[PDB]
Amino acid sequence: GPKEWQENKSWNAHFTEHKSQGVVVLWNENKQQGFTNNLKRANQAFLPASTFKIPNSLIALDLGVVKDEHQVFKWDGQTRDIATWNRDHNLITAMKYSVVPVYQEFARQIGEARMSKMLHAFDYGNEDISGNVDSFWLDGGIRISATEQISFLRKLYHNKLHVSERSQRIVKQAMLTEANGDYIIRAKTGYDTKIGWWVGWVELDDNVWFFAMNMDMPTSDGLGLRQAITKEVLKQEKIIP
């Protein structure tokens, strides 16, 4: 019989070209088949860092902490290192610019009991929120693997998560990253100071490819490699031109 999961080590060339190491995991939805350059690392669990703003957004919307994607979260007046954070935001721009202080406020309003119950209902990673209610995805006990990211994203794509369909549609809107006549990418980046993430999917006319990548990332200087390397794999597999 055919294999659900296949290893393709030729993708390592795209990491080695940049003196880095990592994993790309792809899932072909039509074929129900997955592909990766590193089967073991594909299933190892890491801190989600800013990719947690996908479930955080879903929970905040479903609970009414965030009313809709137009509600304004005012800047608290503290000047931070990332210039795009020093302004008012809504859900769309807070995800686009990965605005930490806005999502810390969401997490505090959600609170520990409801955050834990929702991640259990999502089957999200190891479901463990130990640590600070407003930072556990960066320095606490939650862990998720690349294959677990894909499983979560597939439920989101199909509106199968336990939260309202409305919440799922709003977050999928907020994940929009790039679109043209050839493809649509909905995705979210993350960085925990050691590992960089990019997770999401590529919508084509007749198929959707889910992806989850992480890579060793010692400094923020190489952050654009997250998208660049993933796109090299997508080009090799003839998913995008």
Ligand X SMILES: *C(=O)N1C[C@H](NOS(=O)(=O)O)CC[C@H]1C(N)=O
- Site residues (CB under 8 A) for a second copy? 92-93, 96, 165-166, 169-170, 172-173, 176-181, 184, 203, 205-206
Task: Give me the helices (H) in 142-183, please.
Answer: 146-157, 165-174
Q: How far apart are CA 69 and CA 167, in angstroms?
A: 10
For 79, 111, 171, 182, 194, the CA distances from 105, given in Å and listed in that order, are 17, 10, 17, 37, 25
Q: Least separation, in Å, of the C-beta of 169 and a second copy?
A: 5
DSSP 83: G
- Mark whether 98 is an active-site residue: no
Residue of 167, 168, 177 whose CA lies nearest to 200: 177
Residue 228's binding partner out of Cl ion, ligand X, a second copy, none, with CB under 5 to 8 Å set by partner kind: none
Please state the closest distance from residue 195 (CB atom) to ligand X, in A. 10
Q: What amino acid occupies position 5?
A: W
Which CB, 35 or 198, lies closer to ligand X? Answer: 198
With both helix axes pointing from N to C terminus, report the angle between 112-122 and 100-110 in degrees, rounded to the nearest 10: 100
Q: How far is the CB of 238 from ligand X (least distance, A)?
A: 26
Angstrom distance (rounded) from CA 102 to CA 74: 9
| 8 A C-beta contact, residue 197 and residue 23 | no
Please, which residue, 113 or 179, has the CB nearer to a second copy? Answer: 179
Among 84, 173, 220, 236, binds Cl ion (CB under 5 A): 173
- Identify the CA nearest to 11 among candidates 43, 36, 48, 44: 36
166 is a contact residue toward Cl ion (CB under 5 A): no
Which two structure tokens, joined as six digits, stand for 169? Answer: 């549609």
Q: Is 86 annotated as a binding residue?
A: yes
Nearest to ligand X of 46, 210 (CB atom): 46
Is 162 part of any known ligand binding site? Answer: yes
Among 10, 20, 50, 98, the active-site one is 50
Q: Does 179 bind Cl ion (CB under 5 A)?
A: no
Q: Nearest distance from residue 88's CB to a second copy, in Å?
A: 8
Catalytic residue list:
50
Residues annotated in a binding site: 17-18, 86, 162, 232
